[PDB]
């Protein structure tokens, strides 16, 4: 089958400045009757995929024309004129001249914006989880750019690393910021055994690490 | 308005088989190629197969032959896929869609999509949720604005769905990604609303569990 090399793997981009992509086939995308197949797909996060080119430069109905599309044989390229917050999602180079179709890994773009510090939340167990034997310490770290964080937990100043899941969410369209949330979770009996719980995060935007903690007492 | 409705989410059992339906409306359903589409784990998109209602005929991606099977019903204008003995590579998101390209025009009227349809391939339990609210000690945010969460954990399979004060609270909402961990997932939401609104007007995180009939909602008190 034919090998659809997709180059970069990440774009980063402000709005407003032009993007290109890169999409190289193993065998010639010219077909016989001297037609080339060659398809751009867009696909929005939480959306199916969106065809935005054919025939290797060829607009789809409704797409802006921002984009254009240019390459023969084996080497095709993507552009975006003008960047706007809707091109945010993952570019696929698809390949309909040799049977079976194939498609390229794919391009994420992403909008590159102004550095966002980190709104942190931390949460101890409810009542109802306590109840059930179990619990939950909870923090979210909401809007920061630019991706990269490290969240560590520390338990009464020692680090806890079993225990712990995390989950991002993708850029936001509304804002191009980024948010965290990371869980520890502990048997009720340990959680209460300890004192000071500390969400702890490194990111570029603070030299010293940002942090949220709270002490359980009674009272 | 041309439109492709694709079943719910299916959790199957290995070595098992599954038909997968795709319900169209808004065109004329004999006239146009169907084709299915599969993704992995997000980025990973492979072609599967192609039918014309009109006729019945098929063309399939050889790596799939004897794993898909393409049928359309015409008088419901529906495509189905069925997979058979359904093994770990098979757990993806399938989608149908209405490509476009006219062979004999050698061109492609717009391409309309399914929205997808997600096969787990496991023998684990399904799990009812436990959700639990998350009010403010310290991620109160001091004063201006507070932030509020629920915590929806130990459930299986996938999805869950999650909205504040039924869907009326829907700024400032943040859902993140359920993670896997020991055959259960866990998913959290936080949502922020101004020192003014709570704890005064009430927010409430609503959570649904399909798979198990668990419909809950969980009012965030102080
Ligand atoms: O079939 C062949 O051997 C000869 N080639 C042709 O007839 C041309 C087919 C061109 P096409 O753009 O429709 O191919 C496709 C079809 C569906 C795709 N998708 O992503 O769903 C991706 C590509
Ligand atoms: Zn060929
Ligand atoms: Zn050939
Ligand atoms: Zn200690
Ligand atoms: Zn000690
Ligand atoms: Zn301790
Ligand atoms: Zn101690
Ligand atoms: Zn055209």
């Known amino acids: 089958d034919i090998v659809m090399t997709q180059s970069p793997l990440t774009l980063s981009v402000t709005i407003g400045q032009p993007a290109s992509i890169s999409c190289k086939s193993s065998?010639?995308?010219?077909?016989?009757?001297?037609?080339?197949?060659l398809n751009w797909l867009l696909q929005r996060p939480g959306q199916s995929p969106k065809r935005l080119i054919h025939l290797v430069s060829k607009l789809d109905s409704g797409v802006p024309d921002r984009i254009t599309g240019s390459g023969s044989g084996t080497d095709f390229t993507l552009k975006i004129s003008r960047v706007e917050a809707a091109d945010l999602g993952v570019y696929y180079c698809?390949?309909?001249?040799?049977?079976?179709?194939?498609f390229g890994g794919g391009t994420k773009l992403e909008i590159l914006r102004a550095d966002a510090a980190p709104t942190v939340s931390i949460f101890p167990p409810s009542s109802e989880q306590l109840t059930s034997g179990g619990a939950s310490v909870v923090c979210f770290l909401n809007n920061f750019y630019p991706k990269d964080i490290n969240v560590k937990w520390k338990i009464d100043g020692s680090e806890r690393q079993n225990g712990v899941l995390n989950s991002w969410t993708d850029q936001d369209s509304k804002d191009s910021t980024y948010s965290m949330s990371s869980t520890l979770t502990l048997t009720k009996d340990e959680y209460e055994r300890h004192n000071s719980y500390t969400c702890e995060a490194t990111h570029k935007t603070s030299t010293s690490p940002i942090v949220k903690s709270f002490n359980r007492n009674e009272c | 308005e041309m439109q492709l409705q694709q079943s719910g989410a299916e959790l199957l059992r290995p070595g098992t088989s599954v038909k997968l339906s795709c319900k169209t409306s808004?065109?004329?359903?004999?006239?146009?190629?169907i084709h299915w589409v599969k993704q992995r784990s997000g980025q990973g998109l492979e072609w599967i197969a192609r039918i014309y209602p009109g006729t019945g005929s098929t063309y399939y991606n050889e790596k799939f032959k004897g794993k898909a099977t393409l049928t359309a019903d015409k008088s419901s204008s529906t495509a189905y896929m069925q997979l058979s003995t359904l093994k770990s590579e098979d757990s993806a998101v399938y989608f149908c869609?209405?490509?476009?390209?006219?062979?004999?025009?050698?061109?492609?009227?717009?391409?309309?999509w399914g929205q997808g349809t997600l096969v787990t391939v496991s023998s684990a339990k399904t799990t009812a949720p436990s959700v639990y609210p998350l009010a403010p000690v310290c991620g109160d945010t001091t004063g201006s604005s507070v932030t509020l969460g629920c915590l929806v954990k130990g459930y299986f399979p996938e999805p869950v769905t999650l909205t504040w004060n039924s869907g009326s609270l829907s700024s400032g909402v943040h859902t993140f990604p359920a993670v896997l961990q020991s055959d259960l997932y866990t998913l959290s939401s936080s949502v922020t609303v101004t020192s003014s609104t709570w704890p005064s007007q009430s927010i409430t995180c609503n959570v649904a569990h399909p798979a198990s009939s668990t419909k809950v909602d969980k009012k965030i008190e102080p």
């Open positions: 698809v390949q309909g001249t040799h049977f079976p179709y194939t």
């Open positions: 065998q010639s995308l010219l077909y016989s009757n001297g037609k080339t197949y």
């Open positions: 869609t209405r490509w476009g390209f006219i062979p004999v025009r050698e061109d492609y009227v717009m391409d309309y």
């Open positions: 808004g065109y004329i359903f004999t006239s146009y190629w």
